Amino acid sequence: LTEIEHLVQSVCKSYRETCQLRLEDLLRQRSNIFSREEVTGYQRKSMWEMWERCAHHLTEAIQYVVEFAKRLSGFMELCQNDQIVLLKAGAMEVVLVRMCRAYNADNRTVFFEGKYGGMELFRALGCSELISSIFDFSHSLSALHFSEDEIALYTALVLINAHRPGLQEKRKVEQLQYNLELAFHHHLHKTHRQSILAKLPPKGKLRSLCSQHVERLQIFQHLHPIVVQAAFPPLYKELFS
Ligand SMILES: O=C(O)c1cc(F)c(-c2nn(C(=O)c3c(Cl)cccc3C(F)(F)F)c3cccnc23)cc1O
């Protein structure tokens, strides 16, 4: 009935529609783990072939997040500068949070190209510290056993943050932020899940991992550029020069 319960439903609708795999598909496929021969197959690939595979999965993942953001009540109504500011700082942070759904804490593997594989699968990329940091972040997030609605509401808040440097209409973003915080806290009370609030990762940690990740992606993109058919061209122009 309330404007808030309608917001909860729409955020969860936007989320469910902008998700590539459904949680049950990822959950059932946990048994389908890459063989040592398949692992060796991936480790023996060139850095540049592994970069191409990962770059295209990450760009497709960002594209689903841009679509998620576009479907968030109020986003399209913000100025284009603000829309860029929010997506530039937050789209990859959302991708990093969404990744915990495809992560298995039991064996420390991620669902990649049809099967579950460990971080060793990525050996050829030569950025083990970064990749270990990503798996660690997914490991901490997997302990929360986040529900699909919780991930939807939390990621909307990762994106709609009025504290991002460069916002031109801070107040309009704050209004959207306040409504989403109410939606999230209202839903956690209703479901007796307010306990996750003290367990969420510190804001600086997600920011920090994201900045390290995007910085590496930028280094690879400079060395071996991939072209992408941009869903949001003004955002695309801010990262792809
Ligand atoms: O409009 C689009 O279709 C669009 C696609 C994108 F993938 C991003 C995107 N890629 N990306 C990358 O880090 C990236 C990715 Cl995901 C793959 C390779 C290189 C890059 C890096 F470094 F060159 F930009 C981002 C980081 C934050 C925020 N957005 C992005 C942005 C877009 O506007």
UniProtKB/Swiss-Prot annotation:
GO CC annotation: chromatin; nuclear body; nucleoplasm; nucleus
Domain NR LBD residue range list: 3-241
GO biological process: adipose tissue development; cellular response to sterol; circadian regulation of gene expression; lymph node development; negative regulation of thymocyte apoptotic process; negative regulation of transcription by RNA polymerase II; Peyer's patch development; positive regulation of circadian rhythm
Tissue-wise expression: Isoform 1 is widely expressed in many tissues, including liver and adipose, and highly expressed in skeletal muscle. Isoform 2 is primarily expressed in immature thymocytes.
Outcome recorded upon mutating I131N: Nearly abolishes transcriptional activity
Induction: Up-regulated in the state of obesity.
Family: Belongs to the nuclear hormone receptor family. NR1 subfamily.
Disease field: Immunodeficiency 42: An autosomal recessive primary immunodeficiency characterized by increased susceptibility to concomitant candidiasis and mycobacteriosis. Candidiasis is characterized by persistent and/or recurrent infections of the skin, nails and mucous membranes caused by organisms of the genus Candida. Mycobacteriosis is characterized by infections caused by moderately virulent mycobacterial species, such as Bacillus Calmette-Guerin (BCG) vaccine, environmental non-tuberculous mycobacteria, and by the more virulent Mycobacterium tuberculosis.
Annotated domain remarks: The AF-2 (activation function-2) motif is required for recruiting coregulators containing LXXLL motifs such as NCOA1 and NCOA2.
Protein name: Nuclear receptor ROR-gamma
Record organism: Homo sapiens
Gene: RORC
